[PDB]
Amino acid sequence: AQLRQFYVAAQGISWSYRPEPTNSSLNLSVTSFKKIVYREYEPYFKKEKPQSTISGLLGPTLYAEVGDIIKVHFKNKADKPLSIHPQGIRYSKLSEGASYLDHTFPAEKMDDAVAPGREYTYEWSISEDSGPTHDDPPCLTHIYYSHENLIEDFNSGLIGPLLICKKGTLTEGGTQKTFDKQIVLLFAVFDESKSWSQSSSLMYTVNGYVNGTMPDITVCAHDHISWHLLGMSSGPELFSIHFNGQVLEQNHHKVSAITLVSATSTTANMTVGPEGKWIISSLTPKHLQAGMQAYIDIKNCPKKTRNLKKITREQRRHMKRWEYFIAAEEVIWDYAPVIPANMDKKYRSQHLDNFSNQIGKHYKKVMYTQYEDESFTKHTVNPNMKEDGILGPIIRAQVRDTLKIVFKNMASRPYSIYPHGVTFSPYEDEVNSSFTSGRNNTMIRAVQPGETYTYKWNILEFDEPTENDAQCLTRPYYSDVDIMRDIASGLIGLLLICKSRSLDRRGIQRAADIEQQAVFAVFDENKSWYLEDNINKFCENPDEVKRDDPKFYESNIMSTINGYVPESITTLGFCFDDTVQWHFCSVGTQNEILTIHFTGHSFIYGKRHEDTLTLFPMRGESVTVTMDNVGTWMLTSMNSSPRSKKLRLKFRDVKCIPDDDEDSYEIFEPPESTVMATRKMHDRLEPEDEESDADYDYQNRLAAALGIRSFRNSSLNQEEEEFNLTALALENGTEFVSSNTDIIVGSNYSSPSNILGQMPSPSSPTLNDTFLSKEFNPLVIVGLSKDGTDYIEIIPKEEVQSSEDDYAEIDYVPYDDPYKTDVRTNINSSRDPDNIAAWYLRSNNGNRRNYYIAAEEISWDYSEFVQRETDIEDSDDIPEDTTYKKVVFRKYLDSTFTKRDPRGEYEEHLGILGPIIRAEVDDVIQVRFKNLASRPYSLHAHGLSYEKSSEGKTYEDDSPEWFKEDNAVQPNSSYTYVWHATERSGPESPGSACRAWAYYSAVNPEKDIHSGLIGPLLICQKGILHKDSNMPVDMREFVLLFMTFDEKKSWYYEKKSRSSWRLTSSEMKKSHEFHAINGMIYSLPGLKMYEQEWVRLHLLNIGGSQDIHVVHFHGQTLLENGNKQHQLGVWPLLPGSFKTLEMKASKPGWWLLNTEVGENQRAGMQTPFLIMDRDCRMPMGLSTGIISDSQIKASEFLGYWEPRLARLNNGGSYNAWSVEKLAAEFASKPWIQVDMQKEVIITGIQTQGAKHYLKSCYTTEFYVAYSSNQINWQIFKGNSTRNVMYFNGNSDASTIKENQFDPPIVARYIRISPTRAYNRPTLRLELQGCEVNGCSTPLGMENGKIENKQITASSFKKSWWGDYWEPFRARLNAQGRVNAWQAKANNNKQWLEIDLLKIKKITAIITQGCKSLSSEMYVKSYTIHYSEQGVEWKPYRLKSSMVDKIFEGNTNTKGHVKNFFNPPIISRFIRVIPKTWNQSIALRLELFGCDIYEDQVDPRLIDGK
């Protein structure tokens, strides 16, 4: 246990982004912007503490360890109120640092802002749950900033780092015990226009420097470094950091590039190379336009030589260096190979044709060519596939080997090559500055024309792929002299590094084909230096050209895949039950993010299925796809940007010929070693044999590991250091009910009958609407006019497929014309009978699950629940008050489509989202779709497997005599879709309960993102769902979509007419569209949860572009579960992402939900949510006499049985309320209305019968209604199937029955009405609940908890009659002749004192008294005093003047009176002063309030030193 005390101050300096001096950057007043920055001081603010030289504009680093307390003494020194706010800590209301509407008293409003020249103290406590001990690097990093004004505070500085470490790894000075150096980096963009001073300057900055002017970072050789990477900007930005000639390990993955988004942090581990000076920078072209660079220098520190810097000798049994030959040769390139017949012969297009638009484009390029022997450049080129038009040769290398590359330049300019992450470090010690001068920061030497050179790559043991990776990795390689202009010319290469277990492309499962066709490149001809030569011969004359013409500038950019335009590309074919390994990479960069989606199949990424890929600039990925659906499909750039929508590939999965011999053309793989022409790799030993026929030949100097090698010691021991405090116990992701209301009985249920017994939809007998219809037929109103047509089809007969890796490739001649025969749909009798659901019914699973869905049109208002915040009338939110026509999905009951199913209480935080579709593993789902709109719509699933005639797109090639009924459902029509759940759609083995998918209408992709059609669905394991109703049983689930809506693309029949697009480029229709979560901008209701409870969250984002959303929950830390137990604090969401997370609630109150991206958070996307209390089963009066009889009203009573004089529970002579006549057919029943004058939380209700005159009467069923005003009300429904909740009621007289409201309700008027009863309808009720937006609970726990030593009336204990009326017996319900004391003196100077050990906050007091049957005696008035230590005794007085407020008292022997007081009192000692007494003084009491959470700052190791 330690106390970490820090002294800080925010002060103003003069700064110009240039380091001639380190701190006060001025020279001859060239430029000087005002800035405000944090600074650290010595104790008691005596002298400023000296700063290092690397960090110019960066706050002090804060560090902490689990089990400690942080105290901060912030004070202000600028002309601005400022504050401080951390990110990943468990807050309290006194140490948050942010201001919003949370209904807090004035004493809680000091953290919001401090005045210039004043100071405040911040206290934080760390516990197990906010800990780093979940199988991850020991120390996590976070960022802290100012919350007073997000836009203006950040742009003037005010940024600081925070670190949290595990237990036992920290020293006195803040350093660890193992690592040698810790380095922190910051990347930022500063905009001077939005700042304290108004100017115009935009800077891209590392720390505080611009244009690559940063002091060097010098380290020694072969040392371990720990890196802490941040990144932040006021707008949407992304960073792709790269370290030259180095490799890193992150989250059990070996990487060479680090991707970051604004307001994120990351930790990394690194080992450095032998020597040299290297550059580090980003890869986004916007960053390459500016400097964005930093330098690193490695020196040879003496006597620290670890006997290994980077060296491995040549004693490898299977050496891969051979004689590799490449060349860089000029060529004429034709982009469209369609004008030849089908040659694709990569021959030089010598024809120099010149048209208006180039045909035979003859662009001058330079490309990587390949040869055979050491007599380099003689006419012998190794043949390969006709595809891969412009990519260089593919290179393969394993671990622990050498590669010898011979490069000859023949393109009249210097050129070179270097790979990414392939080598831990090039063997730069061998080379010398005589030739390899390294320029300044390269260490790689270019080669002049007519010269040859040799490079020696060496793969070390530290470059091996980790066990939690794919089969093996892919990396790019290109030129070094000038990255952008060399990339503009067509030279690209790929290198594959494969594992010591992965034999070098011998056999990868059964990989018939390997697709290197996965490179997307954008070529710009305005930057390659070959522009002059082609522009000389392009036009009729070269003297009339200029860059002003858009038709000239835009026409020179070509976006292609593998150098071919997507139009002129043939299809592909694949054998059934075959595996294909793809590897994607993007080199042509357009500072954009790209995503791709497969149709009909799914990926396997790591240990999970994704079915959607997002690729980053200059990054490589590897996936594997299993072929299992016999049909034609298409890879598409789904979720595309508004531009570049023409990116598609076409493939076929054909049923394989059953011939035992010569099913297709195949001799296996005749090369088997990538051998079409030898002598390029003749020393490439046989892939069949690896480095040990019987043993590995080994030569190394194994002394780098100071300790034991310990490769056996895979220290993934799941170590869990534990330390708990307050009420925060250790947690791991499981199914935890934790602390809330719950009972052991009931709970789960089974599903005995599954094959056909599941008919749950028509269960509800009555509903709201009524209009009769039936299912009819598909009813495609339009004729057979090309609704189903061969949109895409090519039939190729090609031999160069070559069956690249393992097994045969189809001949494309002997295929099946339908190739969807199976037995399912290959039926020539009738048409499309829905009996295929009976087929493939998986064993005994059965579980035919039926759903009915309709689509219809409504009107929507974005901002409705803002009324409470709408203090000024103005408009709703805009002069155009946010009302637009939309179309949505809705759920009905039966095939008639006549009655609607009302939305209950669980499903109200949904808004525009449609009904939820739930299923268990391996279940058949039949869904009916009914179109009630005025134009066609369809239904497209996602993730789950399906067969054709169950899709919604209009691309398919398979067009049999069935002109497909689906793909268009015109008005007044219905269809039946059949879907099947399988194993690959389920969750993981050790992961959460289940995951989430989505569906949407997909016939034009601009009706699903917009116009309101969203359909998220859930698939979960066996034994979870309930038989009667498809409901979860274990945990509370929440579903969160959030995405901006643009009301200009929903133009079909919700058309954007609006006075012909009325705007002046300054309206929110165009300028700032509606940022919304579930269709509303603020005040999302229906979010309630208990304290110390587990909640499952499904965060899903689909569609959109260039939108990255960071999610923050105030006061809570969320855990990510599944197979690795990774804990984090903030999650970013990418386009087309689905995530499942778990969360635990910490403390009650009102908290905020937002996204901390920046300027798009102040214009919407905010939501306050509530945590209520641990328990609320406290009676709310109505039996003890607190509630008066004037608040009770009924409509009918028999007479002499009053309705208001009968609400008591356990007494009376004439007891209850009677009606004397039950209704005929329905309830239509008289009601009892109860009012409470306030808003409270209601949880349950008790009931009792009647028994008099040798007769027993009791109600059996009833139903409840509630309201906040007497105008309108609702009917309670939850976990029920008959759309109204029917309670079980009584069974016998004089026996209490208890019921629970599964979601707590909020209201002020309640009314319950019976429906059936035995004998005459009779009732007797009691109510249970608690108070809203406050801590109201038996804090003192006077009735059972406090020991009999702290509540002795030490003030004036002149109380005893003699061992009879001993004090501290003053408890609310003390049976027997026991109560508080009776004063012997009965004077006016004698009072009561109560002591508590810890400071606590008291809110209300209930003073029941006069418990004595012999004689009744109470108190009529009293006053209150309090103190800190016991010498102050500050009287409780009103805000007007110094007057002791008088209080009320009892009025009868059995009476409970509860006194409030608006300002709660925070103290330890309390004193009660009796003033007026009817008779001898007697008392009983109970205290209410709560304890301040983090006051655990008792002295333990002061000053932390």
Swiss-Prot record:
The record marks R306, N307, R506, G507, R679, K680, R709, S710, R842, S843 as: Cleavage. The modification Sulfotyrosine is found at Y665, Y696, Y698, Y791, Y807, Y812, Y862. One of its GO terms (biological process) is blood coagulation. Plasma. Residues 2-301, 320-656, 847-1176 form the F5/8 type A domain. One of its GO terms (cellular component) is extracellular vesicle. Residues 2-165, 175-301, 320-498, 508-656, 847-1020, 1030-1176 form the Plastocyanin-like domain. The modification Phosphothreonine is found at T612. Keywords: Blood coagulation, Calcium, Copper, Disease variant, Disulfide bond, Glycoprotein, Hemostasis, Metal-binding, Phosphoprotein, Repeat, Secreted, Signal, Sulfation, Thrombophilia, Zymogen. Changing Y999C: In FA5D; Seoul 2. GO terms for molecular function: copper ion binding. Disulfide bonds join C139-C165, C220-C301, C472-C498, C575-C656, C994-C1020, C1176-C1330, C1335-C1490. It is found in: Secreted. Cu cation binds at H1112, H1114. Glycans are attached at residues 23, 27, 211, 269, 354, 432, 440, 526, 713, 724, 732, 748, 754, 768, 828, 972, 1279, 1478. Residues 1176-1330, 1335-1490 form the F5/8 type C domain. The keyword Flavoprotein does not apply. Domain B contains 35 x 9 AA tandem repeats, and 2 x 17 AA repeats. Factor Va, the activated form of factor V, is composed of a heavy chain and a light chain, non-covalently bound. The interaction between the two chains is calcium-dependent. Forms heterodimer with SERPINA5. Belongs to the multicopper oxidase family. This is Coagulation factor V. It comes from Homo sapiens (Human).
